[PDB]
Amino acid sequence: LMVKVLDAVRGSPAINVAVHVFRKLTTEEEFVEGIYKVEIDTKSYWKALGISPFHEHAEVVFTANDSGPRRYTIAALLSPYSYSTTAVVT
């Protein structure tokens, strides 16, 4: 096994490189999560409550209200640039 990336560079590039080499209730093992990973406004309400939740008798009301004014302005996500003009105006 032998990988080679970007051996010779002349100039001024804008580079995003990720080299991953692998050789060989909730269970996760022998992994990698989130190599260049972006989460914007990620919501998780109920996750992995437990072994025995709400088992015998339960009266549950679940109101999830996502509202209100929300502005997300991203000029560049995971987007390298060179000799470029990036601007957000208002």
The answer to whether the annotation marks 47 as part of a ligand binding site is no
Residue 8: CB minimum distance to a second copy, A: 5
Residue where the block lists tokens 């992995």: 48
Task: Please check whether residue 54 is in contact with residue 60, taking contact to mean a CB–CB distance below 8 angstroms.
Answer: yes
| Cα within 13 Å of Cα(52), Cβ side | 3
Number of residues this chain uses to bind a second copy (CB under 8 A): 90
Residue 87: CB minimum distance to a second copy, A: 5
Site track 47-86 with a second copy (rule: CB under 8 A), x = hit: xxxxxxxxxxxxxxxxxxxxxxxxxxxxxxxxxxxxxxxx
| Length in residues, the chain | 90
How big is the CA angle at 89 (ends 87 and 90), to the nearest 5 degrees?
A: 165
The answer to whether the annotation marks 84 as part of a ligand binding site is yes
Site track 14-53 with a second copy (rule: CB under 8 A), x = hit: xxxxxxxxxxxxxxxxxxxxxxxxxxxxxxxxxxxxxxxx
What DSSP character marks residue 56?
A: S
Residue 29: CB minimum distance to a second copy, A: 5
Where is the binding site, in residues?
Answer: 4, 84
